[PDB]
Curated annotation (Swiss-Prot), chain B:
Changing M91H: Impairment in the ability to induce mitochondrial fragmentation. GO terms for biological process: cellular response to vitamin D; mitochondrial fission; mitochondrial fusion; protein targeting to mitochondrion; response to retinoic acid. Regulates the mitochondrial network by promoting mitochondrial fission. Changing R95W: In CMT2K; dominant form; no effect on mitochondrial localization. It is linked to Charcot-Marie-Tooth disease, demyelinating, type 4A: A recessive demyelinating form of Charcot-Marie-Tooth disease, a disorder of the peripheral nervous system, characterized by progressive weakness and atrophy, initially of the peroneal muscles and later of the distal muscles of the arms. Charcot-Marie-Tooth disease is classified in two main groups on the basis of electrophysiologic properties and histopathology: primary peripheral demyelinating neuropathies (designated CMT1 when they are dominantly inherited) and primary peripheral axonal neuropathies (CMT2). It comes from Homo sapiens. Residues 128-249 form the GST C-terminal domain. The modification N6-acetyllysine is found at K150. This is Ganglioside-induced differentiation-associated protein 1. The lineage of its organism: Eukaryota, Metazoa, Chordata, Craniata, Vertebrata. Ubiquitinated by PRKN during mitophagy, leading to its degradation and enhancement of mitophagy. Deubiquitinated by USP30. Belongs to the GST superfamily. It comes from the Eukaryota. Highly expressed in whole brain and spinal cord. Predominant expression in central tissues of the nervous system not only in neurons but also in Schwann cells. GO terms for cellular component: cytosol; membrane; mitochondrial outer membrane; mitochondrion; nucleus; peroxisomal membrane.
Amino acid sequence: EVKLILYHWTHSFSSQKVRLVIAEKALKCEEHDVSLPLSEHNEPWFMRLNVPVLIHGENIICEATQIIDYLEQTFLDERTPRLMPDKESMYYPRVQHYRELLDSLPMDAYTHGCILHPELTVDSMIPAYATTRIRSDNVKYLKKILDELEKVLDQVETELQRRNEQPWLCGESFTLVDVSLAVTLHRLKFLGFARRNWGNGKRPNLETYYERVLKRKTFNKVLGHVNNILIS
Amino acid sequence: EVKLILYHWTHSFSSQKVRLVIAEKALKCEEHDVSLPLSEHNEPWFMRLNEVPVLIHGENIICEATQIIDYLEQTFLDERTPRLMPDKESMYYPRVQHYRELLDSLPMDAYTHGCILHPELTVDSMIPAYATTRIQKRLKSKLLDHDNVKYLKKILDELEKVLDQVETELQRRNEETPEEGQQPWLCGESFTLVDVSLAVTLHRLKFLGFARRNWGNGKRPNLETYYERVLKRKTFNKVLGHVNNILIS
């Protein structure tokens, strides 16, 4: 047989997307978490959120987006679910529009702007002493990108509204745009930007979506513990 | 110790640079050649030229040759481990980094595609002729061939201009060196990354058949001497000794 091999950091955002796509497709994959609990400077994984790789026979693929595209285009046995509609399908141009819009969110900026200036976060799951340690980019820049997020989240909420006409974001099937949405939100919850953008009083369809995928078997099996700082 | 793991294609240009740097620094590395003798269409390595390797070192994943080579030079710093780049503050650094960029910017991919297509522009190519034969419309494809040939010529004239500079630099090194004694490499006495880029480039042009155009029979004699000298270098032979022999899988 031909082995499928993945070298990744368990807590890297992009790696989470890749590993969830692997479970959503029911692929056997030999996964190697190369990260270490404590660094040489004695730091745990939630301190070091500063690219994964897939080896499949003769192919080497790098960066999550490229690994996911490789997976979608390569495993086409009928039993293997598709997470993307046919390239000439009516549905592709919409799905790919949200997928690009979600895959474009500055997660790097969010995580760095959560440790710094934690005032903008609410119920952040990162210990408070990271803020002190990391203070040895600016609030102006950070507020902006947070407001941009609202605008993006506004689009998701409005598009999510269409519920009975249960479905997922773009249709009946769980698609690649759902791994981007699911993993994005779970990270925002870790950073403390969840209460700011949904919950009681705000975006009820989005609050229902987030809670629904926490109950999903594949998501739970793959990302159930990634926000638990007690686990290496 | 912490393992060095390398996934690569033996015959890819970028894998060749990385593997040679590993051997020049005398690093232990678990190397995995992912390539297959025969493809799904039952084709050998010399049929299938079109490759980005990855290095796993502890917690680091590094992809692409230049980035892997920059990673090696910067992290492996034991006193017994050779450096292939002079200290950033050396007289020599700007000269080395300047040729390093000049060589690492050559479109090797376009040279190999333009060899499989349009072999009439190659001489004594080592790729079989039968690789080419396999690889309102009438006037559309005619215009593509014309544009691709114009491009291929252009980049081959650029190669010559790169090789003219190398030849002149090797002339400076020959004038500085007594003919009895240890001959320098491109930028000085030490073998540097720019020498691994140059060696692997020249070996590859030889394979594609773009050597006789650029050296031999009086043209670029220092470069010719350089090429023949690096074929005898121990690490080069150990690592690349057989990468141009289509009889070996």
